[PDB]
Amino acid sequence: SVVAATWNAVQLEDSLGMEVGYRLIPMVDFQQDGELLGRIRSIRKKFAQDMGFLPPVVHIRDNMDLQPARYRILMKGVEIGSGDAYPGRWLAINPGTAAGTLPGEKTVDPAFGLDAIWIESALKEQAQIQGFTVVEASTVVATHLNHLIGQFSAELFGRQEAQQLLDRVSQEMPKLTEDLVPGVVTLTTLHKVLQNLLAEKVPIRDMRTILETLAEHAPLQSDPHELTAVVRVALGRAITQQWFPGNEEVQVIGLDTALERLLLQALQGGGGLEPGLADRLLAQTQEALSRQEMLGAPPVLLVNHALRPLLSRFLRRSLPQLVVLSNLELSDNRHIRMTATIGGK
C-alpha cells in the first residue's frame, strides 16, 4: 500500500515542466477548461513542423508557494522563464505602430519586451481599434512557452530525442536510414550535429538533404565539428532565405581586411593575438550589432568559411542574438553589401 508511495516521489525527471499558480489551474485541468492544453500541443506540433523534431511533453501541476497568477517554466528542473497571466483579463500588446493609450496594469509582453497593458474584457474592442494586439490569458503562457522552447531547442534535443527523430524518419526514408546508423555514422555523433544545427537556429525539417549529405562525407570522417559545416553548406539555400527572405539585398556584418588576415594566422599556427585584441574583437562586434540594428538590418556576420565555426561559438557565448554565416552558405544569386565592419579605422 504505502510501499509504492516512496518510489513515486523519486520517479521525477521531467525534461520540460511548468509549475502553475492556483488561479491558473482551471485552464490546466481537463475537467474545467483545457484551453491551455490544446494550446500546448498546438505549439508542439508547429515546432515539430517548423524545427524538425517533436519537443518533450510539458507536464504541469500545482505550486502554492508561488503567487496566484504566476507561472514558472523550467527545463529538467532548472528555471528558464516566468511571468504573470491574469485569467480574467486580456493582454493588450502594442507593436509600436498602434496609436493611443489604455487604462490598466502597465507591463511588457513576456517574450519580446513590447509595451503591453492588462485590460478588462469590455475594453477588448477598444485596444483592437487602437491597433493593440489583444491576447488571451492562456495564450500569454503558451506564446511564452513556445518562445522559450525555440530559445532552447538544442538543449531540449537529447540522445533520446534523436532516436525518435531517427524512428520517425526511418520509415518514410528507409533506404537512407538502415545503412546510416550505426553503419556510417554513430548515433552519438549523429545527434551532436543536428544539435549543432539547432543551437545556431538552423532547422532540421529537411532530413533527406541532411542524411544524403552524411552518406557521402561521413564514411571517412566522423568529427561532428566538420560534418556540421558540411551539412550546413548543403542547407545553404534555406539558411540564406530565412535571414534574407525574398530576393532583396543581403546586407551583412563584415570583418576588417586586416583582422581576418590576423585572425587566420592565429589558427594557421603563425601567431595568436594578445588577449586584449580578443576582448577588443568582442567590443566592436557589439557596436556592429547595434549599428546593424540602427539601420534595420539582420544581425548576420558574413565570414570566411575557415573562420565560421570559431567566431560562431566564440562570439555567441556572450552575444546569442548574432548569426555567423559562412561565405559558402550564402547563395550565389544574391548581391552583398557590407554595412557594418569589425576592426575598422
In DSSP notation, 18-53 reads EEE-GGGSGGG-TTT--HHHHHHHHHHHHHHHHTSS
Place of cell 555567423: 324
Which residues sit opposite 72 in a β-bridge?
Answer: 19, 82
Taking the CA atoms of 284, 285, 288 and 290 in sequence, report the sign of the dihedral they define.
Answer: negative
Cα(231)–Cα(204) distance, integer angstroms: 11
Three cell numbers written together for 275:
588577449
CB–CB of 44/1 below 8 Å? Answer: no
- Burial of 173: CB neighbours in 10 Å, binned 0-12, 13-18, 19+: middle
DSSP code, position 249: -
> Could you tell me the CA-to-CA distances from 229 to 162, 182, 224, 305, 344 in Å, in that order?
19, 21, 9, 9, 28
Give the chain's count of helices (H) and strands (E).
13, 12
The continuous run of DSSP H or E covering 61 comes out as strand 59-62
Elucidation technique: X-ray
Alpha carbons 237 and 241: distance in angstroms, whole number: 6
> What resolution in angstrom units was achieved for this structure?
2.8
Nearest-10 crossing angle of helices 35-50, 137-151: 30
Backbone region of residue 131 per phi and psi (left: phi > 0; alpha: psi in -120 to 50; beta: other values): left
**C-alpha grid cell for residue 329?**
552558405
Composition of the chain by helix, strand, coil, percent to 5:
45, 15, 35
Q: Identify the DSSP state of 223.
A: -
What's the rounded Cα separation, in Å, for the pair 288 and 292?
6
Please give the grid coordinates belonging to residue 171.
520509415
Q: Which residues, in sequence order, are bridge partners of residue 342?
A: 255
Buried/exposed code over 10-39 (b: 16+ C-beta within 10 A; e: otherwise): eeeebbbbbbbbebbebbbeeeeeebbbeb
The rounded radius of gyration (Å) of the Cα atoms in the chain is 24
For CA atoms 303, 309, 315, 321, the dihedral sign is positive
**Cα–Cα distance between 59 and 38 in angstroms, integer?**
13
Cis status, amide bond into 110, omega within 30 of 0: no
Which amino acid is present at 41?
R
Single-letter amino acid, residue 295? L
Neighbours of 140 (CB within 10 A): 23
Beta-strand pair 90-93/133-135 = antiparallel
Side chain identity, residue 99: A
Residue written as cell 525555440?
Answer: 150
Please say whether the beta carbons of 213 and 234 come within 8 A.
Answer: yes
> Is the dihedral angle over the CA atoms 206, 208, 212, 218 positive or is it negative?
positive
C-alpha cell at 290: 547595434
What is the C-alpha to C-alpha distance for residues 285 and 172, in angstroms, rounded to an integer? 44
Q: What angle in degrees, to the nearest 10, is found between the helix axes of 224-234 and 187-199?
A: 60
Segments in the chain forming alpha helices (H)? 3-9, 35-50, 124-130, 137-151, 153-156, 159-170, 187-199, 207-217, 224-234, 236-243, 257-267, 275-294, 308-315
Q: Is 211 helix (H, G, I), strand (E, B) or coil?
A: helix
